[PDB]
Ligand binder design. Structure first.
Ligand code: F3S
Ligand SMILES: [Fe+3]
Length: 65
């Protein structure tokens, strides 16, 4: 039970999140990051932390619900 949060004022479009977890983050060429699942399964928490770590602006975050 967690939610993937994106500080959209901080996303500069590096698209490192899509390279680390492509199933859960998609970045349009002309758009910022799009969170495909806001409430992903518990098995996906590992690959999503990769995207949180790999964001140079730290726009992504995991919030426990
Ligand atoms: S800048 Fe944006 S495109 Fe992803 S790697 Fe960080 S949330
Ligand atoms: Fe890992």
């Amino acid at each position: 039970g967690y939610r993937v949060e994106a500080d959209r004022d901080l996303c500069q479009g590096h698209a490192m999140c899509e390279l680390e977890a492509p199933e859960y983050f998609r970045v349009p060429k002309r758009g910022q990051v799009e969170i495909l699942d806001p409430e992903p399964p518990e098995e996906a928490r590992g690959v999503i932390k990769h995207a949180v770590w790999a964001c140079p602006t730290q726009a992504l975050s995991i919030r426990e619900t």
